[PDB]
Amino acid sequence: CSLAPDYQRPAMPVPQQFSLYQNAGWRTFFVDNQVKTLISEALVNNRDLRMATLKVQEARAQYRLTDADRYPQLNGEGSGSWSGNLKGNTATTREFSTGLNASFDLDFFGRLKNMSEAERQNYLATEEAQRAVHILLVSNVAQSYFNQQLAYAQLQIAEETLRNYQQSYAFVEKQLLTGSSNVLALEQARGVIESTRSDIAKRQGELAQANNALQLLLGSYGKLPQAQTVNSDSLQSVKLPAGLSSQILLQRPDIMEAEHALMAANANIGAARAAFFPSISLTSGISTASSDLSSLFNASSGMWNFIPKIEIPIFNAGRNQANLDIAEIRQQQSVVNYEQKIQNAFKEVADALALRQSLNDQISAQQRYLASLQITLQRARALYQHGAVSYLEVLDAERSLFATRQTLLDLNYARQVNEISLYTALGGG
Amino acid sequence: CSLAPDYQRPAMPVPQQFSLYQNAGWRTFFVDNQVKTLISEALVNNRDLRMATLKVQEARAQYRLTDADRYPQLNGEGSGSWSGNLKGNTATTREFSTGLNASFDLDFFGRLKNMSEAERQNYLATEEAQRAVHILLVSNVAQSYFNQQLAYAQLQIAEETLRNYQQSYAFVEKQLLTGSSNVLALEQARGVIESTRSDIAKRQGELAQANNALQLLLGSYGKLPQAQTVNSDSLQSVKLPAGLSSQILLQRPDIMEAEHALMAANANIGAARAAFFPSISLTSGISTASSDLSSLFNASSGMWNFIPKIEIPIFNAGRNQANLDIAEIRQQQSVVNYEQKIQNAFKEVADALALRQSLNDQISAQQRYLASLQITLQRARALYQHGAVSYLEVLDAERSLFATRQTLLDLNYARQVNEISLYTALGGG
Amino acid sequence: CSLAPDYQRPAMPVPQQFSLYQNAGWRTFFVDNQVKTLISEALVNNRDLRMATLKVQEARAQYRLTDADRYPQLNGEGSGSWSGNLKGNTATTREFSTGLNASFDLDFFGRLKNMSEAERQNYLATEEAQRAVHILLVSNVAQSYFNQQLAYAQLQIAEETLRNYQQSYAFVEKQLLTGSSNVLALEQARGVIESTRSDIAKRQGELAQANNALQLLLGSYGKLPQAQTVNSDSLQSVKLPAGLSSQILLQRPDIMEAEHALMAANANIGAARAAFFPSISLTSGISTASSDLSSLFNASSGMWNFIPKIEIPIFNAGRNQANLDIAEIRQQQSVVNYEQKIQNAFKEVADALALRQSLNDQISAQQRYLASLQITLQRARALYQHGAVSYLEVLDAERSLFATRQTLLDLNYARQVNEISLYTALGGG
């Protein structure tokens, strides 16, 4: 029988709503097909996930090892014994023996059963941890893919900005050849060509870094995805009821893992309680003995045997009690751990919801800003070409336009990362 | 008796001065009352700290478990034994027995005593670690609070900057309606409205993130503090003698923790030394036996018993010596750990002192810069409105003014974080 | 004998080339002599490395402890036994005994041998980890040194930029005193003085922080290096064949560490296999006994003794099999760990190669940009001083010039860090 306390799910340590459903599969959440191809490959070859799978097997084997301790043992024994005096008849005595013995703990108060149940729960927790690494990998690969695509896109706008600045410069040169501009405007147009080449070189770096990170995550080194057009429709962004319950969190693998750890701790309390109670063992044996080898295996020399035993703990100076206290304190630790895991999950979902609003509003504003800058550039050119304003007006408008384009790319990347983070924080596929 | 070496505090691994006292309580260090209310709540509900408290209890129980091993044990035993031959009189022999036995290790050379002392020191170290989590939490909550307030303040100046830019734009529009300005100036004034809306949306994000981080730290989800006015007087910044001794560091909990770990290691050396010496045990028992159950508990079948024993290690192939070496090497590791903890603490205090000077000087300079920018803006407006300069003068002055205001807010936040870090690095309250 | 599987190096988990040799010693790689002096000091006093050295000693001792378990033991025993009835002749029986006994496990199937070999391999792995900390420290010290030098250089250009801005301001003042400029230009020139003072204060902070980090790494607090002139020739940057083989990675200490861990796991498989097989032990003793102490050590009371024993596992409910499974699964884990270590190393080398190209191209472009900005500044001054353009042209050119200089310093630092990272990722000296 078991002395373990019954499982009780701790009180929800977070509000019941995120601020006032089930995810689709990742094959549906991700629209872009390239990212899905990379995710599938990662699921096969990624080393971290492979390691997480092996840890599940290990824990399964440890469960088996511990469970085995509940079953009877049967073992053989062989012995020979020479001995004699040191004075007063120096004749050697000699005896041979052979034992075949079985052993069995009755485990009436469930010590061994519960140590086993604890290992089974650790195994269950380990499977959940595995599931967590699985969804975190899907998230990470996808993000890594979009980071690569961001690098491509940044490189692309940098090159077309280079082309633009080269045209601007050629034009100012032509003007100068007609004694129509000045040497200041020319040097300004030349400068921005160089800073743009610098940006190009930077984006090449980031691309290479993105590629290398992606290949580490895949655990494979085949050809990388090429640049593709990517947008808000690349993901099927989560739609959520207005009063989505916090209870969705309890479905994440990492939270289920914590739950199983809590059950393991309950089982360890049962095991520690059992120590206070009598324990009954049983050993039975077939045995033989003889002073010489010849008549050893003689039925004549044989003996059967059957010996039940009971041990009764009486006083142990608070050993059992201290050990029980450790188990109880550790169960309390598991409860806090469970609470921490949920509070952390709640923070991830709340942040991603807030960030979704913030990022959408930043992007919208940034788009309107860009449109205004394009108009500004056009007006500045016209006014400059008619000698009404200095070339600094053109330079300034170009710089801001280019910076805004790079910022807008970064924001769209942040938006996709956040959508992926949200999906994942809700438990993924 | 104990074979452990005496404790000796390692030579100070850092200079004796920080570069040429006792903290007040956090209730006094923090002036702002809101932050103190949040700190008090965190001290109650925060999960990390609760977990640190449970670890102290666990270590206390482990100390008790180990100490118990020093005391006598008294246990019961019950047995029944059926056995018989296999040929040549197949009559079964049967014997029942019941033992009540006491056990006691004399521990003359302090093996068990020292293993106990080691656990007591681990327990002491664990209390110190707890105290460390406690002061780190006070620090973190306070910082998290000021980060929230920074977000509020950034949002506030962004909105008033929005209002300003809308007035600027309305004015340029009016000018245009009088054929007095141009379409370039108008588009420039429009643009900055949009970039400011973008900043507003960003600050809303950061606010939401700040709120969520603060609630994670509190472990509670009641209403959040509203924006309040915050300044250098929100903290009672530490005043330090010119030649403050490094010795103040030895009062931090994390350093005391290291000290207790060092004592534990000393105790483990004592325990390992004891293994080389004889060990004396003592077992005494009341016992009975009979071939049938009826005359079992007969005083007739009973026997008392008393058996002192001594074990003497002679040769063990370097087992004891290797084990002693591990203990000695581990004590050396504890010494290095202690040194590392102090050197790290010294770095924290030195950095915060340097940062205090740097930040004060940056803020002072930035204030003078801001004042200059306000004047510049005013002059640019006047000159622009009289057709003496382009609107780019106004735009440029506005942009720099706004950026400087945001920078100044960030610097004041950094200053408070650094003051808090300094307080904490000196051991907190 | 050993039941362990033979070592087989896992298939290379990365491409055979980095994208289409041996490092020199760090004394040769680093040209700058100051950095080498700091590296030498760190190698002596650094706490992390000292700790890594102690861990090697600890593992060596654990190897010795485990190996000792393979050798015979010889121990002494002394006993006295008083016992008597409880009724029916209350005369006490009394017996004294003294045993000297030897013990020896034959270890025919190599259980103990392999547990020893596992510990020897853990020791070997620990030496490699030590070597890793050693090369990582050389890297970190060098980087920390160049970061200090970066701080010095940033402070220096900030001060000369301050001097420049003060001259610019004095000039505008003079112009105003001749009713030749305006109050806008003056306030603009004043502003940039203040922002530059802010930068100066920031660089003082960073310098102080750099110094404190460097002293933590050195584990010593003597005088710090002063500013020196530093450039691309401070390091003898690695030259690599076009088709450098990935195989160079297998020379890194961290990868060799993984290899030894793999061998340890192989040994543990051997140990677990041995459990299925019979085990033969041997105990031999000299012994005495007597009812009184006087005739105790009488050769008369003495007995010699010799007892070989064999244990044969028959059925254990899958205990041995589960334990074997754990060992096999753990060996598979070591293989994955080995693969991870290599893939990670491959990423470090690939990133550093890409970054070397990117950084060189950014620096080249940034130099050309700087040269263009110097010309722009000169042209703007001339045009401004002749009333042809506003002072905003001068301000703008100064700001960009100063920002580009700071950026160029940061890029040169990044280049040196990357060269150091490359050297280190290839196995260092």
Author numbering:
A (entry chain A), B (entry chain A), C (entry chain A): 1 to 20, 32 to 440
Task: Give the published text.
CusB is a membrane fusion/adaptor protein (MFP) and CusC is an outer membrane (OM) protein belonging to the outer membrane factor (OMF family). Together, CusABC likely forms a protein complex spanning the inner membrane, periplasmic space and the outer membrane, analogous to the well-studied AcrAB-TolC multidrug efflux pump from E. coli and the MexAB-OprM multidrug efflux pump from Pseudomonas aeruginosa. Thus, the CusCFBA proteins form a tetrapartite system dedicated to the efflux of heavy metal ions from E. coli. Here we present the 2.3 Å X-ray crystal structure of CusC, the first structure of an outer membrane component of a heavy metal efflux pump.
There is one monomer of CusC (440 residues) within the asymmetric unit, with the biological trimer formed by the symmetry within the crystal. As is the case for the other OMF proteins, CusC is a cannon-shaped molecule, forming a ∼130 Å long α/β-barrel that is composed of three monomers. Each of the monomers contributes 4 β-strands to the 12-stranded β-barrel that resides within the OM, and 4 long α-helices to the periplasmic α-barrel. The CusC trimer forms a huge, continuous internal cavity with a cylindrical shape and a volume of ∼28,000 Å3 (∼90×20×20 Å), which is filled with water. By contrast, the interior of the entire barrel is strikingly electronegative. The channel is closed on this end by Van der Waals interactions between the Leu403 residues of the three monomers, analogous to the situation in OprM. In addition, an adjacent ring of negatively charged residues (Asp407) provides an additional layer of closure of the barrel on the periplasmic side. Thus, analogous to the E. coli Braun lipoprotein and many other bacterial lipoproteins, CusC is most likely triacylated at the N-terminal cysteine residue with N-acyl and S-diacylglycerol functions.
